[PDB]
Design a protein around this ligand. Structure first.
Ligand code: PMR
Ligand code: PMR
Ligand SMILES: [Cu+2]
Lengths: 400, 419, 419, 400
């Protein structure tokens, strides 16, 4: 038994990233209830994710389901002329029904173009976990991107607009050339990928995304992920070195934000000093987070858990992360909870389902779902990340 | 298909999950893909269960699709029995496993578990969450509840309360206090606050009390058929409904009707000078059928409101809701689509909206005072405090909760006029 | 002659009303100009009391102010006994009658009414409403309560609860439940549930429970000296305070505690990962001293709030508030002026504010989450529902009431952001 | 015992009419508590009434009290320079102190007279009660209004802006007589009164205003007051007879408002046909109230009680009123309430202090405090006036 969500959970923040994208989930009532419950207040704002329930006749006849899907997307386009890119999202019942979402997306991209472009990616739990939904969305975007011949830097990841602005400003004042972001808000702003175009990875879970841009000739930048202070520095240093920027120029670039990041981290890390942290596999963010907490926050790590390790992209953080913490990759809540109980960790990064139950048993818990939502990457928000991890400990100390 | 964004009821297995979470010693083994564990986040967070839901998921993937599915189910059931030591086990299927070549029955009974195993056949694509909650409780009763010699003194069973239910916890206490005042001791409360031993003891009660028809009607009818227990047909929400329930339960038990009306303040507070502005207020009502019917009675007879709209998302209770709506001179709104309820609200333009969380948000966008009276709710709605909807103190809660939006709107409008 | 727009407390005669109105069979005449009748409808509407307040104004005018004031008072006392049939009479003057050369004591004594008559000397301009209530209850005790024989079972008196008090009814019920669980039977609840016979029986109780020091400290001290009755120094608002109250009352009675903590939900709901955003939220507190001190303890230890403001409008309770505020690293704001508190809130900028109705309105203009925790309240603030501030269920009420503003603001901000 | 309010309650609806008037009550804490309690929500919206509390040091002496009052008025003027007509309202403690509010007005209208014209009137319960405060406020302003040499009709009586607008619109449609309502919203457009001008009340209780305008030389025209279709019809008929407007044009201009008013009155009064009404002396609106309920609404009045029954100005209304109902002068609230017990009326129009106890005893209750607030005059609000009494009976029928 694994405690993860199917990749449809990434949809809610992907669609906040993409103002122009609608996320049509071809799934059963269970996946619609997933989207509704996960979103919470979000669904009452009339968001851009909707689920088409595969009715009994739909699972009975594949052709009837295909025609119904065609009519559904026609009605959706009629209702919303604003949507220019539409994401047909695979689901578990859709996969078992085996209706070809790729053949569909091809057909409706043909008969609704050149205005509306329809992509397909699978968020089904049978082949997707928490953040591989966003990974698969971005992987679906990559092949349709134009083949450029001018070298550009491509930031890949769902940076919040303020975090994107900080990263873009820091790069542009750093001295790089073109900087573009793969999750472009509008289809017109989609980046160009070519053999000469380079890309740097902001969030770890984009493994299939990195594989996708590797094929088009784009080359990876080996950097740690810009979570706290040093994690961000090493990221920008690798970017500068691949762009050939002089080290002294980059130091003059990054000295000013570095001091504030250090001060903010030290302000909120005081509660985390001399403490033990346990990472349950949630969002593939945990090796880097453990690196940040161990090196910067002075927090011992007993075990870091990951849904699946992508060693190539995650290598720098694992190298920075101490040899002591043992990385577990298998998700099995039955034995994992016994491991938590044996470890007796001060802080336990787990899912929202396990948060309250472990809290009752006497374990302070932090839920990693807040990391993807809240802006925690880069320097300005490093203190926010530290405080996010330190607040449960403060609450337990206050509440005794 | 239709492009749904908000569903009033979840998938049917969520109802069985609620039933299992309510009981103690019962474990749900679900053939579901990894990612269907989200439903455990309702109980742990919205309901704030200090313990994990008693549910084990097989969590099969693309690799465990061809033949590994049955082996995964067998291993999950066996390991759940060994780890959790449940007094009984319920086995079911998710929406994905319906198309999968899944045999819950044989896989469950092959392991020869010493504890009784309850087999659940729920049509996932056809039915909804309340059907799951009703059918799971019914099948649990068939597997465990047996005809049994009645208790020496008069005993009653509270049938209907389940996990993730609207104020079920406080209504149990209120109805228990009412019955204790009447001289009736509650034999068992099921599904919530129950065990397989409690389900077995269900046969001991002299009569059944159906607080919530949605999740207990089928159990009550089966008890009437086999265990020879009459079941109450009045849900005690509101002063009038509470008195009718008290009279009917006293008739059923043979004890004298004794109800404690000392705490009751809703009739006096409604008859007060301050509640004159409540007269003739147009109220739109939506949500599950029992609460909507009871709330319409409360509004019209005790609150002075005129019911401008009625509705439910329960097709299984369309006939009682349509009969009630005809009673209030209206046509019921039996739909599960929030767009139709929104259209009815816009056309009707009610002064106050009593309904679900979706109706509360619709009223918020339309600037209409709102209160929550029905099942689909957030983490916010569940009280830390004693907030029953039934009994006399529940009537007090109903009055205060329904007035509070009107009071806020009136105060805001007054201070807007003044400055 | 400072210009006053809002007064946190009324004149002392309003406090005298809050004592006489609570007690049954105690009517009081009160020398007032024709037009002081406004104060009775406070109980009539704010408290929603069906019974007319047991008050008989003289209602003198310019045609009776010269020399007919004494005649009007004599007629008022005569008629009050003749038709209202009070078990005891209490006598006072309003501010206008304080200025006019009248003698309340002489006329009442000359009438020689067989029912006991208590005489009140309240400095109207110097003192305030809480002094009026406390002194009135004190004089009633001295007139009626006399050293008596103790009861067989251990008995306690709930001293302090008066009419027009914040949640006094539900707190009486909750403290009575705690004491019944302890095994202690409440001998008398005064002044709200008392009669002159109950004031006489006050001597029978083994010890006194001072629920509200503002209206009961003088009575508690006088019973400590004359009646040899120890009284509790802690107020059971919040789980920590409730457990301290249980421990000290068990020590006083000699029984064991039997704290009933099954109802308790606030500790778990605070420890839940939902309430993580509550940590360090800045809270400004104002109102009467007891509630502010208790709310500060709850917010800091039980709620994880950072108390940034502590204040009281009872200058008579400045010393305990000053000590308590020094406990939290702050200086107490002991003022009866709403402008000073306005300035403190503006400078401080708290995330949440718990105080009076004026405090809630200040927050509304300033756009800060607000809950009401203290005595100056509106008609809407008096609940039909069971809403205690004391005991373990009162802890749940406190948690939900304080969370509701923060949850509402968070949900509104999120909804606006997503829009 | 008189269960009535002192005249300070008139302040609360007066200053809504006068946007440039501040009512400074010179009284004890009791009168400040009165103003705050009766304002209710309003005191949290920076009202224009404030009570200067008299302390034991302030009570002793008169010159020191006068100096302190001057200092307080200066402090108020500094905070609110906009105010240009201050209303020093006497109170019960002020009257017992004998603080010469007239002398204070004389001094402060010499200090800042050209801008701020300080008025004084008694609002003390020993002298004035309920709406007597409003008519005293209007009787304090008339003696200082400028003399005029042009015959003009003036609307004496504080009315809501909507009711005022329709009153003046109807009088304009009459075609003869331009109107100048006596309450001036600001001192800027204060009106003129003299032997030329002729005045007509709109609200029954303005007897002191009768005295002031009679000493001014203006002459009263007796008319039933605008409470219901017939009342406003006879009011405007008296206006037309006073101004020589021909009957045919008056019929033409009031045919349609009379039609809507009659329709609304019948619709709201259908629940009150064959019912019994009792009037507890609150605000002298009750003789006109009883007339309107008796003929237009179909009620039968067992008693009409008035705190001060000014026969000369109410005369046409009693003439319309039937001989059946008894007229009560003064209040013995115990005797009056015993009479209410004995009569068992269907509806009892009583004060707010007795309103809840009467219902607890089994009698329906309407409160005229709302009537002094709510717009209930002339033709359009005739339906609202009828429904205000209708609603309690409807609620009693619905609830049980
Ligand atoms: C689907 C699982 C689930 C359900 C039932 C809800 C309701 C709920 N999810 Mg939301 N949510 C769960 C967890 C997650 N939710 C999502 C989002 C989200 C976050 C960032 C937050 C949250 C939370 C909530 C809430 C509490 C609402 C709150 O007060 O903010 C519940 C009951 C809420 C919380 O944990 O409070 C500290 C909060 O800040 N969920 C997502 C990411 C796709 C998941 C899967
Ligand atoms: C004597 C003072 C007093 C107090 C304690 C309040 C509160 C109170 N006065 Mg308000 N009010 C009292 C009566 C009157 N109030 C005044 C105004 C006013 C009216 C017209 C109204 C009202 C009301 C109230 C209120 C209820 C506020 C509410 O409706 O939410 C109380 C408790 C309110 C109500 O519904 O009464 C039936 C309402 O419509 N009072 C005035 C006229 C100046 C008086 C004297
Ligand atoms: Cu609200």
């Amino acid at each position: 038994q694994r405690e993860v969500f199917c990749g449809l959970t990434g949809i809610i923040w992907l669609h906040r990233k993409m103002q122009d994208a609608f996320f049509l989930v071809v799934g059963s009532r269970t996946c619609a209830h997933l989207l509704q419950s996960a979103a919470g207040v979000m669904i009452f704002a009339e968001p851009r994710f909707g689920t088409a329930v595969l009715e009994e006749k739909d699972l009975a006849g594949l052709a009837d389901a295909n025609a119904e899907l065609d009519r559904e997307v026609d009605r959706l386009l009629a209702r919303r002329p604003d949507i220019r890119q539409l994401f047909l999202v695979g689901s578990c019942p859709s996969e078992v029904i085996k209706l070809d979402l790729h053949r569909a997306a091809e057909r409706l991209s043909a008969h609704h173009g050149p205005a509306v472009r329809v992509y397909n990616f699978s968020g089904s739990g049978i082949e997707t976990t928490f953040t591989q939904g966003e990974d698969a969305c971005l992987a679906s975007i990559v092949p349709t991107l134009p083949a450029t011949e001018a070298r550009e830097l491509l930031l890949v990841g769902a940076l919040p607009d303020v975090v994107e602005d900080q990263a873009v400003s820091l790069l542009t004042q750093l001295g790089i050339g073109p900087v573009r972001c793969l999750p472009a808000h509008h289809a017109a702003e989609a980046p160009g990928v070519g053999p000469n175009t380079v890309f740097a990875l902001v969030q770890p879970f984009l493994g299939d995304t990195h594989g996708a841009l590797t094929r088009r000739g784009a080359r990876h930048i080996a950097a740690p992920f810009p979570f706290g202070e040093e994690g961000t520095t090493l990221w920008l240093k690798a970017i500068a070195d691949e762009f050939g920027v002089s080290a002294e120029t980059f130091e003059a670039v990054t000295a000013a934000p570095r001091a504030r990041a250090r001060k903010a981290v030290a302000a909120a890390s005081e509660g985390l000093r001399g403490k033990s942290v346990f990472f349950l596999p949630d969002s593939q963010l945990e090796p880097s987070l453990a690196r940040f907490l161990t090196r910067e926050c002075g927090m011992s790590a007993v075990e870091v858990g990951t849904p699946f390790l992508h060693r190539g992209i995650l290598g720098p953080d694992l190298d920075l992360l101490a040899e002591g913490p043992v990385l577990s990759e298998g998700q099995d809540v039955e034995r994992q909870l016994d491991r938590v109980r044996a470890a007796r960790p001060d802080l336990t990064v787990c899912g929202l389902g396990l948060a309250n139950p472990l809290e009752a048993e006497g374990f302070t818990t932090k839920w990693a779902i807040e990391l993807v939502f809240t802006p925690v990457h880069f320097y300005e928000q490093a203190g926010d990340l530290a405080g996010l991890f330190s607040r449960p400990v403060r609450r337990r100390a206050i509440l005794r | 298909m239709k492009l749904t964004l908000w569903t009033y009821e979840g998938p049917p297995h969520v109802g069985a999950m609620r039933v299992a979470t309510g009981m103690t010693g019962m474990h749900y083994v679900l053939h579901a893909p990894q990612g269907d564990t989200y439903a455990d986040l309702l109980f742990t967070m919205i309901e704030r269960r200090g313990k994990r839901p008693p549910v084990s998921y097989t969590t099969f993937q693309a690799r465990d699709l061809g033949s590994d599915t049955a082996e995964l189910f067998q291993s999950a059931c066996r390991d759940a029995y060994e780890r959790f030591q449940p007094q009984a086990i319920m086995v079911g299927s998710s929406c994905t496993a319906e198309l999968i070549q899944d045999d819950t029955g044989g896989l469950a009974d092959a392991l020869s578990l010493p504890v009784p195993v309850v087999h659940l056949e729920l049509p996932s694509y056809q039915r909804k969450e309340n059907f799951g909650a009703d059918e799971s409780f019914l099948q649990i009763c068939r597997k465990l509840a047996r005809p049994m010699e009645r208790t020496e003194k008069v005993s009653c069973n509270l049938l209907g309360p389940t996990a993730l239910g609207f104020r079920h916890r406080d209504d149990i206490l209120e109805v228990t206090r009412l019955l204790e005042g009447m001289g009736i001791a509650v034999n068992a409360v099921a599904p919530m606050g129950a065990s397989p031993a409690d389900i077995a003891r269900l046969g001991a009660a002299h009569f059944n009390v159906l607080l919530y028809p949605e999740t207990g009607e089928s159990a009550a009818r089966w008890a009437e058929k086999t265990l020879k227990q009459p079941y109450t047909k009045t849900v005690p929400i509101g002063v009038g409904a509470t008195r009718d329930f008290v009279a009917e339960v006293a008739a059923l038990a043979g004890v004298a009707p004794v109800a404690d009306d000392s705490r009751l303040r809703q009739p006096w507070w409604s008859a007060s000078v301050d509640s004159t502005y409540l007269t003739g207020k147009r109220v739109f009502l939506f949500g599950d059928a029992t609460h909507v019917i009871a709330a319409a009675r409360v509004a019209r007879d005790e609150m002075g409101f005129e019911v401008v709209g009625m509705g439910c998302y329960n097709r299984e209770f369309a006939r009682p809701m349509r009969a009630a709506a005809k009673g209030y001179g209206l046509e019921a709104l039996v739909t599960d689509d929030y767009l139709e309820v929104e259209e009815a609200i816009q056309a009707l333009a009610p002064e106050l909206i009593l309904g679900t969380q979706m109706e509360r948000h619709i009223a918020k966008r339309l600037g209409i005072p709102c209160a929550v009276i029905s099942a689909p709710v957030h983490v916010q709605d569940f009280p830390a405090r004693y907030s029953p909807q039934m009994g006399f103190e529940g009537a007090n809660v109903l009055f205060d909760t329904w007035i509070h939006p009107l009071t806020m709107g009136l105060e805001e409008h007054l201070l807007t006029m003044f400055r």
